[PDB]
Amino acid sequence: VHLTPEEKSAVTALWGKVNVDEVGGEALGRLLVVYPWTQRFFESFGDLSTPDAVMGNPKVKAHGKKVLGAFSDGLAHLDNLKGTFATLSELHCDKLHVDPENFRLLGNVLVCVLAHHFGKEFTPPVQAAYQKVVAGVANALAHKYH
Amino acid sequence: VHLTPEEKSAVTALWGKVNVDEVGGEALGRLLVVYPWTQRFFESFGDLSTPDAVMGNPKVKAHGKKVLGAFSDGLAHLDNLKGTFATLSELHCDKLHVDPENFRLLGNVLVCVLAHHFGKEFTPPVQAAYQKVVAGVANALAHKYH
Amino acid sequence: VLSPADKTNVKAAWGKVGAHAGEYGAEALERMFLSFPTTKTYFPHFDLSHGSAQVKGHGKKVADALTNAVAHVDDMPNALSALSDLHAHKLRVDPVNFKLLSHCLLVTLAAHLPAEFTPAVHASLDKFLASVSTVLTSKYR
Amino acid sequence: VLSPADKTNVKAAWGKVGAHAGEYGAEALERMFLSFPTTKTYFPHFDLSHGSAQVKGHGKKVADALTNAVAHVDDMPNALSALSDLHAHKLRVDPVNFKLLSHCLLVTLAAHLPAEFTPAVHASLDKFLASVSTVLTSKYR
Ligand code: HEM
Ligand code: HEM
Ligand code: COH
Numbered sequence: 196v197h198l199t200p201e202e203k204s205a206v207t208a209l210w211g212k213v214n215v216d217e218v219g220g221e222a223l224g225r226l227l228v229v230y231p232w233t234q235r236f237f238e239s240f241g242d243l244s245t246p247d248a249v250m251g252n253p254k255v256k257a258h259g260k261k262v263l264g265a266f267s268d269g270l271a272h273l274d275n276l277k278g279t280f281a282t283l284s285e286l287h288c289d290k291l292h293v294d295p296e297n298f299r300l301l302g303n304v305l306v307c308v309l310a311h312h313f314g315k316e317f318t319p320p321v322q323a324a325y326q327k328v329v330a331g332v333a334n335a336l337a338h339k340y341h
Numbered sequence: 342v343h344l345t346p347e348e349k350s351a352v353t354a355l356w357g358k359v360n361v362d363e364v365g366g367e368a369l370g371r372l373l374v375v376y377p378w379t380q381r382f383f384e385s386f387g388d389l390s391t392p393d394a395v396m397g398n399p400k401v402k403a404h405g406k407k408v409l410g411a412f413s414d415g416l417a418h419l420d421n422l423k424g425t426f427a428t429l430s431e432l433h434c435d436k437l438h439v440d441p442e443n444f445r446l447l448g449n450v451l452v453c454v455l456a457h458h459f460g461k462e463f464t465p466p467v468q469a470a471y472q473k474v475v476a477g478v479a480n481a482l483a484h485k486y487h
Numbered sequence: 488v489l490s491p492a493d494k495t496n497v498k499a500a501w502g503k504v505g506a507h508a509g510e511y512g513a514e515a516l517e518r519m520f521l522s523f524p525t526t527k528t529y530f531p532h533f534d535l536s537h538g539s540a541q542v543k544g545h546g547k548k549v550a551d552a553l554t555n556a557v558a559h560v561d562d563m564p565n566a567l568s569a570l571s572d573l574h575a576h577k578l579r580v581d582p583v584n585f586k587l588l589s590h591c592l593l594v595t596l597a598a599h600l601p602a603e604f605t606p607a608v609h610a611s612l613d614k615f616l617a618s619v620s621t622v623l624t625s626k627y628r
Numbered sequence: 629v630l631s632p633a634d635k636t637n638v639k640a641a642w643g644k645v646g647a648h649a650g651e652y653g654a655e656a657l658e659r660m661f662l663s664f665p666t667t668k669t670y671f672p673h674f675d676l677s678h679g680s681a682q683v684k685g686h687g688k689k690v691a692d693a694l695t696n697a698v699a700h701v702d703d704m705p706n707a708l709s710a711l712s713d714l715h716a717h718k719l720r721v722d723p724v725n726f727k728l729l730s731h732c733l734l735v736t737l738a739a740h741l742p743a744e745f746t747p748a749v750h751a752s753l754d755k756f757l758a759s760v761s762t763v764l765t766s767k768y769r
């Protein structure tokens with residue numbers, strides 16, 4: 196995607212402070228709580244019946260970390276998100292059968308989690324820059340659906 | 342966008358049978374009837390109070406003809422819609438303040454109009470080719486919004 | 488909210504659909520899978536090639552539910568209660584895909600009902616399919 | 629449909645907003661104009677620069693309507709009746725834009741409410757803003 200250099204250094208600076216394991220676990224857990232039909236893909240994961248059960252489930256936290264890890268690696272290649280995520284795009288279509296609308300919902304939950312975590316440091320221009328990035332990563336992950 | 346030569350020749354073939362003035366009048370009038378909030382740009386145009394008033398309004402007909410003629414000239418440049426509609430995108434943002442969701446609603450009403458006009462010749466592969474073209478035109482007209 | 492005039496227009500149009508409801512139901516599913524390939528992620532267990540018995544079967548089931556909703560258009564929450572539990576708790580289709588099947592059902596009706604698909608009936612049918620989508624989406628959270 | 633727990637979670641969270649409701653409404657609008665630039669097409673007559681009195685004035689109106697919706701959360705169609713007339717017949721805001729403001733509102737509440745914006749309160753607030761959005765677009769057609 197196309198970020199102005201002051202949007203790129205807003206995204207970069209904020210992300211140096213993110214504990215990927217902790218924010219990942221929170222973003223995937225809040226996805227499964229706020230939009231519970233996304234639990235569809237995870238019934239091998241255990242008890243997902245209350246908010247407290249989802250946020251403390253160890254397989255949600257482990258998977259959350261896996262997901263934000265691969266998202267982190269895409270922040271390093273913001274000039275060609277489609278090439279970075281082509282293999283995972285193909286895997287989420289052909290093998291996991293994940294409706295790409297789920298990537299957009301996680302994108303917006305991750306902006307809520309960053310806002311919750313960083314408070315007044317997550318200013319309206321920094322949010323704007325992270326909304327272009329998570330729309331770009333959603334886009335990249337949907338590209339090889341067929 | 343990206344159409345295969347068999348999807349390009351199916352779009353091209355069917356459009357050779359379109360009366361652009363008549364289908365324009367019908368598509369913009371059905372946009373204004375089915376989704377009445379799109380009438381907000383057009384109170385300069387007179388009586389839009391009932392379905393029959395909308396569909397017989399000569400200004401709605403004249404505007405539908407102008408809109409669909411620019412669409413038609415855009416089917417000759419399917420390789421480069423963004424370049425072809427860049428000035429019209431700027432104009433619809435800066436001067437006419439048209440929410441780009443109106444181009445996606447017009448694109449879906451244009452596909453129901455082609456289906457009504459062409460009946461069983463509008464097959465499921467032909468529809469799929471025209472959905473890519475109208476999503477591409479909507480994208481192109483939304484591209485220089487800021 | 489469906490106006491009484493919308494209910495008259497939906498009953499007239501779906502009246503003409505009549506016995507072809509099952510066949511139109513399958514055509515709309517096939518138009519959905521070709522036009523919007525991301526909806527195929529909810530049917531990985533189906534043969535989705537043209538004319539398969541699974542799609543024609545499913546088409547007939549979609550169509551009988553819409554016939555049930557037209558017959559009870561004043562009482563669609565109670566009429567589709569079983570179907571809104573099934574999509575909310577078991578299938579869990581993301582709500583964005585109901586708009587994609589409604590558009591392909593509308594396109595299929597357009598292509599088969601040349602005399603009946605007037606502007607006002609198009610409006611009323613779009614509005615009816617959005618109310619069915621809202622009811623099937625009601626109990627998701 | 630808001631459960632008794634969702635209403636308790638929205639009244640608690642909006643209670644702790646209290647007097648800052650106005651300031652949080654303006655911040656949510658600013659967030660919406662920068663993140664989703666297409667929503668600026670409904671405000672060509674405003675100064676949308678940072679700190680604008682027009683956005684702050686507008687923000688306070690949005691927030692007072694949401695405070696009125698929380699107080700009347702069992703009877704939101706009648707409380708918000710004049711505002712659904714207004715957005716349906718005069719402003720005529722496309723319905724997709726309500727989901728963009730609702731997300732920005734949630735981000736604003738998240739940024740100002742570190743302890744209250746629990747995963748369960750987040751769910752309840754998202755359901756509440758979707759119910760306000762459904763009422764404000766009820767009369768569009
Ligand atoms: C106009 C709205 C729709 C109607 C009326 C409708 C109706 C139905 C009906 C009647 C069934 C069969 C239930 C049974 O066996 O008792 C069903 C199943 C199902 N629906 Fe829906 N549906 C709608 C929209 C959707 C959409 C939007 C999708 C996904 C793109 C979807 C995906 C499914 C799937 C996965 C099944 C299960 C099929 C199987 O396992 O055989 N439905 N629907
Ligand atoms: C949570 C949803 C919303 C609430 C509660 C809300 C509330 C209001 C209120 C209270 C007013 C002022 C009414 C008056 O003048 O008496 C208003 C006006 C307006 N709203 Fe909304 N609104 C919402 C969503 C939207 C959205 C999503 C848009 C556009 C992106 C929008 C565009 C407008 C505009 C254009 C005005 C008029 C501004 C002016 O000319 O002064 N509103 N809204
Ligand atoms: C709610 C659906 C959902 C979403 C939003 C989502 C969003 C994202 C996303 C966007 C930010 C990225 C970067 C990833 C990245 C990944 N996902 Co998904 N995934 C999702 C459902 C899954 C599931 C399902 C698996 C498989 C886990 C398992 O049980 O093996 C998966 C696996 C993965 C893996 C592991 C693949 C392997 O070969 O082992 C990576 C990494 N991903 N995912």
Ligand code: COH
Pocket residue numbers: 379382383404407408409411412429432433437439443444447478482
């Ligand atoms: C519902 C809003 C709507 C839609 C969907 C829409 C969709 C489309 C569209 C999608 C296929 C195309 C290619 C066009 C193409 C055009 N539009 Co619009 N336009 C719209 C509202 C307008 C308005 C309003 C104007 C100004 C008309 C006037 O001033 O007479 C406009 C003007 C134009 C013009 C004239 C430009 C000039 O030089 O004056 C063209 C060409 N367009 N428009």
